[PDB]
């Protein structure tokens, strides 16, 4: 199967990649934010939205990878192999979760279409060279 | 956060664990089944159901976990740890995906309440010793 | 005192012993089943039934013996003596708890009189030699 | 499961622990008292009350725990562990049965609410230092 | 700032010191009593009273000192320095918390003015030499 | 007991921790501010508000913690432990008092709901990278 997790939400993997990697917050900071803003609704027994259902699975999969790292470190008593697995996750998969977490959190706070219009505006703005581009970047509040 | 991926779908992790792990199909067989029955709807740009949204994220995360296992199998220096980490990924996180994939596929084909009634009936049936239990097990339809 | 825990529930220790010991599920499997079917009612602040009150005390006494084993193993640092205490419990008292747990769980799911009629029917059936006895045994279901 | 044997009887483990352990009678003395006051009803084929059902299971489990202690005292090879395991059974699980036996006997003789009001009054009284506390302690009526 | 924690409650540090230190229960016993009598209201989301607000901060500060002791003992692996910090707390600050805990608990159970009248009566009584003073001391109730 | 000092005031420990620790003023500066703005009311014999009662206990407990730190700095024999225990008191328990002092001062000057709305807005703002976030941060007034 060729599945795009953004496709049912009016976006695509390409559109998210349009933003530079450095622009996304850390996974840690996005999880703290998900809690801060939406802990009650995430843990609730209501399908509040597709964004909520998407966020739940993503948070639990990141959860599984962190349980694996801890398990390797303490249960296998092998911190070296632990450090390699953390390094592999952060290098190879961290960006994907950063994009996905940011996208679904941003979509809930600011609204879906606002986040889309913001991806195009910011990518244009950032690519425009410093001299040419307006000093005040596009904002979502 | 304490999130339960089954909680928004009227179930829980405990209820799913009530079925013995050996009685779930393989991940490979569930993915082929997901395709066989629902490839068009999974790949579509419509939020067909929370089951569809849940399945999409799970199917995509499994890809990443299998790339991790392969990577560990080639790249992990310590022979003691390596085979254990591959085994843990394939079987221990494998069981979670087997439960989740089976649950969401079963819920779409046969209906949510049918799947729930079936979990309780089968767990009781399987635990009942051979002599005591009916010869014909409970059937999903 | 000569107390029979089955006497207030229309049965006796003799009637329960009428079933072969091999016929009962494991303690572990009966506790998982008690949870699966009745966790909410067991933990509730209502005397739902004498079966519930009986189950609560039995589950907690098994609980106490398992806390003792763990305590011997980890707190006294003596796994050898741990293994002897587990072995003593499983050979000497496990059958009693298996009979009692099965009885009170079976009485709640299928109804008290049904379970009684089933004890007599099954004991007769199992004692009748293989050649002579019907192929389909009595079923509680 | 998190089961509280006092919860269905309007109390909790915390409330019972509010009384110092030294102020409960011996298990032996509570069993003799249970007999003295209620032998006929305990041994009867009627569910006289939840207190009666609770008492029956507790009295029967104490028998098993005392057979375990005796067995450990003769059969446990390791002298360090043996005396500690006997001591743990007699005193540490002994306190639980002392609390539970006293509670259910006291509830039958004096009434449930009277026993509850008495737990709070006595715990306050005993903790208040000799100088500060009234000479007449609370009495069970 | 010169702040008196008793001043807003119609008392002072001097008036509390009027009672001998030996008269107060242990911190441990007052915390168990605070729980026993008021766990629900202390943990609740209502400002039940200034006594409740005062008690919450005091219980949490004692909590912080006990987390420090544990941290020194286990995390710094230094039980010696642990023993010195516990000794310093118990000799230097324990009386203050004993006075404050007793005061706010006593004020809630027996009423504020009753506790005040009781401080003066008891201090007079205790200072009156044994021969001269009534045999029955003043009682809180 | 699980007590939250913010729970009575419509907030929680999690919500306060949402702000980075570095963005709170020093304890010294918050105490000078508490004096500057509210010395008369804090030292007064009126329960002006729950915020005032909370502040009084916290300000008095900080005194005791600073006497402990000084005492450890002169009197703790083990050089390894001593600097770590002073550092832990000043920074780690310091953060708790910084959060609590700031919270209760901010609640009195600007109003409770304003402070809450400000915690969420600022945490979001600070976590969102410079490029994404508005140049003007949220302001307390
Ligand atoms: C765990 C489990 C799984 C199934 C499925 C196994 C294979 C696919 C369809 C049913 N069943 O029938 C069980 O009883 C228990
Ligand atoms: C918990 C408890 C129990 C008793 C009973 C022990 C024997 C039966 C009557 C009292 N007393 O006297 C207490 O103070 C406290
Ligand atoms: C953690 C923290 C603290 C403050 C206060 C710092 C100074 C006192 C008033 C606000 N602010 O403004 C933040 O954004 C974050």
Author numbering:
A (entry chain A), B (entry chain B), C (entry chain E), D (entry chain F), E (entry chain C), F (entry chain D): 1 to 141
Please share excerpts from the published article on this structure.
In order to understand the interaction between HBV core protein and ciclopirox at the molecular level, we purified and crystallized Cp149-Y132A in the presence of ciclopirox. A 2.3-Å resolution dataset was collected, and was subsequently refined to Rwork of 25.8% and Rfree of 30.4%, with good geometry. As in the structures of Cp149-Y132A complexed with other assembly modulators, the complex with ciclopirox consisted of an asymmetric unit made up of a closed trimer of CD dimers, positioned in a similar fashion around the icosahedral threefold axis of the wild-type HBV capsid. The crystal structure of HBV core protein complexed with ciclopirox shows that ciclopirox occupies only three of six possible binding sites in the hydrophobic pocket at the dimeric interface of HBV core protein due to movement of the F23 residue and proline-rich loop 6. The binding pocket was formed by hydrophobic residues L19, F23, F24, P25, Y118, F122, and W102, with extensive van der Waals interactions between ciclopirox and these residues. Y118 in particular played a key role in securing the ciclopirox, by forming strong hydrogen bonds and salt bridges with a carbonyl oxygen, a nitrogen, and a hydroxyl group of the pyridine ring of ciclopirox. When the hydrophobic pocket to which ciclopirox binds was compared to the hydrophobic pocket at the dimer-dimer interfaces to which ciclopirox does not bind, it became clear why the latter pocket cannot bind to ciclopirox despite the fact that the two pockets have very similar shapes and share many of the same residues. First, the absence of binding of ciclopirox causes F23 to rotate by 142 degrees and to place its phenyl ring into the pocket. In this conformation, the phenyl ring of F23 directly collides with the pyridine ring of ciclopirox, thereby disallowing ciclopirox to bind to the pocket. The second reason why ciclopirox does not bind to the non-binding pocket is that the proline-rich loop (loop 6, residues 128–134) surrounding the dimer-dimer interface moves ~2 Å into the binding pocket when ciclopirox is absent; if ciclopirox enters the non-binding pocket, its pyridine ring may clash sterically with P129 of the loop.
